[PDB]
């Protein structure tokens, strides 16, 4: 007897799987990195700010 | 050439106890301002998977 067959199945190859749900956690530090000059140097003088004269 | 005696008299009084938060006190409004529209890009890029450079120059 044969035993049930699963029939045609599609193997996803090893790098379109990784590019449909690999992590991205370098490119989110780098994101992160280039985003924080634009981000924080306002930052920065904000707390410039602060810290001079409202004390 | 009377105003900058009367002027230095002034700001004198003033350093008897200047603390002068005038400009600063204008100056964190800004910064700080710059900062809460900034905080919301980070949380959003990566629970939305925005990226940051398309949407750079409407950030």
Redesign the interface.
Known sequence: GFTSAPGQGGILAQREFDRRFSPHFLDWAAFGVMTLPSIGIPLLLWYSSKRKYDT | KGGSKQQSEEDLLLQDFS???S???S??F???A??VS?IP??LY??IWHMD?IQSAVLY
């Open positions: 603390r002068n938060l400009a600063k006190s100056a964190l800004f910064g700080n710059f900062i900034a890009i980070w890029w990566r940051l």
